Design a protein around this ligand. Structure first.
Ligand SMILES: [Mg+2]
Lengths: 441, 429
């Protein structure tokens, strides 16, 4: 009735996915094998797990998500891991020789190799599904298939269904921290082929995960376990409406042309809170106002792009748990109140409340403390264009020096893809350039 | 029999009517199961004009469910009194409007209207002398308005004699629960000014103000709020439901309320409203509740009588009293603040009484007066629509529905026309 499905790519990406399905399975508490601890009573009023966990004729409830990546080592760990009763073989599609972070390889070269298997799996699930709203696709501009092969993936999947929503979680090159140097190539080559195949998607950067887990989670020494846990929470709440009763169970498609008013600049930030320790869970109270005012801390901004340097457009503060329409509401007045913040005035307010009544659940072994209320500030501003500009200037020079270009030209891409894709970020620079212009008079 | 029906869409409104029928059940004291457990035939006398007996005495509503996604259908389907329903009416959607009103009006609007208007029509045959029906949604989106626009058009044509008393939620000036509100709203209100017979304004912030200040409550939700409003919307048919030494129906009301058909947006006042201690401060008199009646703080709408002028004013009284008081306070008040009483409408205040108040209280008051203060309401919402329509902000979600902008101009100079229209009537003597 209300389905979504997750797709996983790139090393960090399927790392995220593993964390996620660990999470949801924890949260509905269905045991890793595929059974719930106990029988399910027959009831109505709304869906349940049925969105994602797959009903069998018995205690076998597998996700509705798919793995695809050409670097097949790690995924085997899932193939080995505790959830080897959880998942399902045909759920698993991997490539042996990954891209080597040639975008053009797993996009072009090995792009040709596994696509059809992917699409068949997709047809099996969507055919298995009925009211699948949209598509959860995860990848990374690092684990190279996460850029290339995913690029073809949406490039064709969109042309397959279209009417489904594109739920885009991919990681963005951290501003000064990194993984490689061809990242310019991965990213921008992705981007010009990303945009028109993307509906909307958010940009998760890691350095924020570090700084904030270390200060706010009080973390001393983190890694992808903590990161994947954190994105696990954020996606855990970004879709609760289709999973749990909330006052305004807003929906993705609902989010689509309302958060991203124009068609073009359709990405965003997301600073979840309240992430604190057990020793800050106590020694604190964690007000709605604390999560709320705290929600707009630029230093809390969960992607390393200063909001205060941008002007907000929309903010879908979907809330978990014991939320009051009034209290949050006045907090939103407080958000109108913030002098430092500046909004796409031709969209004076574009707010859209989310009050889901389940407060958050915590993953044992985790660092986040337990609370009563969650916020997701999926918000869109002018600010985020800048780091892009860093990307196209860095890539600008490096590409000017023809660095690495032999690698890509060797695999079947043309140079005008490069300069033209730079025209692509040129245009989007005109977009964040223009939409931020205040309409005259 | 002047019986009527209910139809609800709306992100909230679907909940609203749930509370509403809930309340009426209380005033009819029939079990959740659907049989009567009360103490006077009077609850049974006029029971039909909202309810419907069933074979075996299943007593049922004349309600119509609107929704574009079954969750609400499950929700109220999970509702106490849920066994008091008919499974037939659970007419919902598989998609949701996403509140682009064109989506809920063309896309899904045209998609699911048919099954509704059919079964509703089967209810139309179920109605002997249908006084009307009650629609409910919100005027800012599509979860209700998406289709409810089509309802008002279709049934309005299909039943050009029936009353269409329309309550839908108005976006408060301060808090924008969505930014596509000016557009859904304006596109709707173009329709509603043409097609709807009665309308009363549904703000949230007023209801907050009532709960927090005058209710002295800290914890606001919807459900209490729908209690506060279904109190009034439940009062409205009281005489029509029960005897009254001074009775007046919706026809007598609107015809006795509206000078010209474009003025069926009405504001609302209901009372008393206390917290528990208050009774041990104060007691109940007709003059007392009168002294609440003309309270801007009970003025549950974005319009200010303190700023605008009462084009009309009326009182809905349920209880047992002396009208010799009632009128006396009436005229007294019609003098006391004459200036906010429009001039050439002599005795612009008008009266009523129901022999029984609502349950639990001894006397009832209701005020659905109509000033023209709403002009700031339309002016605001039209203004925001104006700004982002300069920007075309989220036109792409919009034109993706395949409407034209010229429609936006139509509801635009339209709605401005209605505003200035209220200006001249307010500015005249
Ligand atoms: Mg790989």
């Amino acid at each position: 009735m209300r389905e979504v499905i997750s797709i996983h790519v790139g090393q960090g990406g399927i790392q995220v996915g593993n964390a996620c399905w660990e999470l949801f399975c924890l949260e509905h508490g269905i045991q890793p094998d595929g059974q719930m601890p106990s029988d399910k009573t027959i009831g109505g009023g709304d869906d349940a797990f049925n969105t994602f966990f797959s009903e069998t004729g018995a205690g076998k409830h597998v996700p509705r998500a798919v793995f695809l990546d050409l670097e097949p080592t790690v995924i085997d760990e899932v193939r080995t891991g505790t959830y080897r009763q959880l998942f399902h073989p045909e759920q698993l599609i991997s490539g042996k020789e990954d891209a080597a972070n040639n975008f053009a390889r797993g996009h072009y070269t090995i792009g040709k190799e596994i696509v059809d298997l992917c699409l068949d799996r997709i047809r099996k699930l969507a055919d298995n599904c009925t009211g699948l709203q949209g598509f959860l696709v995860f990848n990374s501009v690092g684990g190279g298939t996460g850029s290339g092969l995913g690029s073809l993936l949406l490039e064709r999947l969109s042309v397959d269904y279209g009417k489904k929503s594109k739920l885009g979680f991919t990681i963005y090159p951290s501003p000064q921290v990194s993984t490689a140097v061809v990242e310019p190539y991965n990213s921008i080559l992705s981007t010009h082929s990303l945009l028109e195949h993307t509906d909307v998607a958010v940009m998760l950067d890691n350095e924020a995960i570090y700084d904030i887990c270390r200060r706010n989670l009080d973390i001393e020494r983190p890694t992808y376990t903590n990161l994947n846990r954190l994105i696990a929470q954020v996606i855990s709440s970004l879709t609760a409406s289709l999973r749990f009763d909330g006052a305004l169970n807003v929906d993705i498609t609902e989010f689509q042309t309302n958060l991203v008013p124009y068609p073009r600049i359709h990405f965003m930030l997301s600073s979840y809170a309240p992430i604190i320790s057990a020793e800050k869970a106590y020694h604190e109270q964690l007000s709605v106002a604390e999560i709320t005012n705290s929600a707009f801390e630029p230093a809390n901004m969960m992607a390393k792009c200063d909001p205060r340097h941008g002007k907000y457009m929309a903010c879908s503060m979907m809330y978990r748990g014991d939320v009051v329409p009034k209290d949050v509401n006045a907090s939103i007045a407080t958000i109108k109140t913030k002098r430092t913040i500046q909004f796409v005035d031709w969209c004076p307010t574009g707010f859209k409340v989310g009050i889901n009544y389940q407060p958050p659940t915590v993953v044992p072994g985790g660092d986040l403390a337990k609370v009563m209320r969650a916020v997701c500030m999926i918000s869109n501003s002018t600010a985020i264009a800048e780091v892009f500009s860093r990307l196209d200037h860095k890539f600008d020079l490096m590409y000017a020096k023809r660095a690495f270009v032999h690698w890509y030209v060797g695999e079947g891409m043309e140079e005008g893809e490069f300069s033209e894709a730079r025209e692509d970020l040129a245009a989007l620079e005109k977009d964040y350039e223009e939409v931020g212009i205040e309409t005259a008079e | 029999m002047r019986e009527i029906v209910h139809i609800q869409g709306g992100q909230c409104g679907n909940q609203i009517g749930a509370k509403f029928w809930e309340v009426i059940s209380d005033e009819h004291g029939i079990d959740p199961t659907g049989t009567y457990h009360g103490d006077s035939d009077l609850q049974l006398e006029r029971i039909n004009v909202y309810y419907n007996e069933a074979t075996g005495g299943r007593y049922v509503p004349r309600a119509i469910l609107m929704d574009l996604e079954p969750g609400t259908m499950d929700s109220v389907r999970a509702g106490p009194f849920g066994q008091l329903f008919r499974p037939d009416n659970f007419v919902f959607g598989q998609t949701g409007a996403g509140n682009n009103w064109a989506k809920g009006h063309y896309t899904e609007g045209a998609e699911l209207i048919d099954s509704v208007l059919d079964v509703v029509r089967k209810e139309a045959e179920g109605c002997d002398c249908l006084q009307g029906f009650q629609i409910t949604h919100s005027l800012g989106g599509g979860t209700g308005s998406g289709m409810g626009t089509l309802l008002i058009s279709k049934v309005r044509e299909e039943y050009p004699d029936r009353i269409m008393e329309t309550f839908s939620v108005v976006p408060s000036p301060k808090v924008s629960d969505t930014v596509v509100e000016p557009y859904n709203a304006t596109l709707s209100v173009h329709q509603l000014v043409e097609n709807a017979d009665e309308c009363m304004v549904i703000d949230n912030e007023a209801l907050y103000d009532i709960c927090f200040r005058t209710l002295k409550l800290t914890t606001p939700t919807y459900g209490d709020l729908n209690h506060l409003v279904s109190a009034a919307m439940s009062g409205v048919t009281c005489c029509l439901r029960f005897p009254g030494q001074l009775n007046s129906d919706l026809r007598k009301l609107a015809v006795n309320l509206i000078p010209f058909p474009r003025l069926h947006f009405f504001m609302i006042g209901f009372a008393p409203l206390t917290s528990r201690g208050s009774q041990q401060y104060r007691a109940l008199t007709v003059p007392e509740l009168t002294q609440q009646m003309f309270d801007a703080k009970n003025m549950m709408c974005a319009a200010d009588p303190r700023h605008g002028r009462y084009l009309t004013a009326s009182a809905l009284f349920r209880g047992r009293m002396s009208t010799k008081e009632v009128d006396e306070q009436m005229l007294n008040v019609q003098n006391k603040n004459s200036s906010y009483f429009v001039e050439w409408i002599p005795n612009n205040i008008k009266s009523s009484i129901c022999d029984i108040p609502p349950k639990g209280l001894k006397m009832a008051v209701t005020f659905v007066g109509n000033s023209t203060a709403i002009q700031e309401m339309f002016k605001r919402v039209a203004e925001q629509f104006t700004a982002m329509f300069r920007r075309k902000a989220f036109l792409h979600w919009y034109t993706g529905e395949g409407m034209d902008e010229m429609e936006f101009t139509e509801a635009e100079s339209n709605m401005n026309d209605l505003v200035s229209e209220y200006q001249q009537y307010q500015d005249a003597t």
